Amino acid sequence: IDEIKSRGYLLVGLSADFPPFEFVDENGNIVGFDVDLAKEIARRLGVELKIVDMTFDGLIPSLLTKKIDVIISGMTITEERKKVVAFSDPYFDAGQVIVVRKDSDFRPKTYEDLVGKTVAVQIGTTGDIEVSKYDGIKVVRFDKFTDAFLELKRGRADAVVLDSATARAFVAKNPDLVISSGVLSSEQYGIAVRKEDTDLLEFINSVLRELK
Template identity: 30%
Template sequence: MKKRHFLAILGATALLTACSSQTSTTQSTTSDSKTTWQVIQEKGELTVATPMTYQPTSYYNDKKELVGYEVDLMKEIAQRLKVKVKFVETGFDQAFSAVDSGRVDVSLNNLDITPDRLEKYNISEAYKYSVSGMIVRADDSSSISAKDLSDWKGKKAAGAAGTNFMKIAKKQGAELVTYDNVAGDVYLNDVANGRTDFIPNDYISQKLFVEAMKKENPDLNVKVSDVLYNPSQQGIVMSNKDDTLVDEIDRVLHDMKADGSLKKLAEQYYGEDVSKPYESDQEIPTIDISDVDSAE
């Protein structure tokens, strides 16, 4: 799926520049002559954008340690690449702009691999496979149960602006209620008290999070619906300036899949192997959102 991007060198322009100024023919910054991977090697650090508020991918545990499937994945990748890793708290709305600006080297936030994103970025091979789902009220007052998502119209969907989940909600006629990079319990409480009707998001992650929250508050009026849609796969997003970094990361991911360490990490945080394509006995519909420009 990966689409490589190459910069074209205009010979005529280079010749014109050489004629106008002899010194300009050799004018080139050191950073321009180095690849993305060479720059990271020299600074000895891989900078990673992560939400830090989303279980089980990126969150603080009881010991105030940043952990999660994506966090531990990047720690392992950095270790195998022999560089340090630095995490930068970044909400979904900044996940791509942080890469664009050079604030971070890579971005992870359960980001789906999609054709439009592959046009703009280099994205690693999938480190996680999943399917979309939703959290609704446990007393069924959300009144959302159609397998084809036909009953989303007019319902209040909660999520971060710009996500594919919210684009699906927009496509299905839901009213969008967007949040900044807030903790998951804010979402759950708003569904429970009726401020919103449902949370479209990653099904596997939602199951684990709701289970954990209901252990703390058994009376919390939420549950994970059994309605599934839009199978997905997630990758690590980075600049497409050149392919050196994505090649290095893909090499490590391939090794982690081969030696079983990625599966072990997946089972640690999800209780199942999400490093392979999601399997289901039921037919899972796919909502086309290629014509949805924004979910804001």
């Protein structure tokens, strides 16, 4: 709080490849739900918003080393992450789905249908964590969902595992892709802050409570 207020700018870490929460528009702005949340936290602090964009798997370590104040980046509240960092009250529900090529005959519905397929994930996500739990799935890991889909679209992967909302976002803009599966997990995004910064966390929950 008072390091942020001193410096006049709240540093947000995210990965701008995840509509409709964080993505790059036609003008090269990071826009969408998570950015608006950030704007409304910064606005309430009287500081300005500095968006730091980086790969997803860079967020926790960035935050643990003070390069950022918060992670607002469609980040699922996991017990495993809850061990190193602290989370806000939940701000959105989502779950893993499987996106395939609408061409293909292949319509997986469960993770077991992906066994002996090549599956594209974003390193360090809950999709990555979860497909990695089934043997036989040949998991190929990408820094960016952009390149995970590119590769599906080429033919070099049989599917992409990611959150429901973003899947819908990516599918709306690639009519050669379809979501084959229903929702395969039950996740809730939170806003990640260091465990010491409890007066920041409480502020975020006050703002979060005030928006809803």
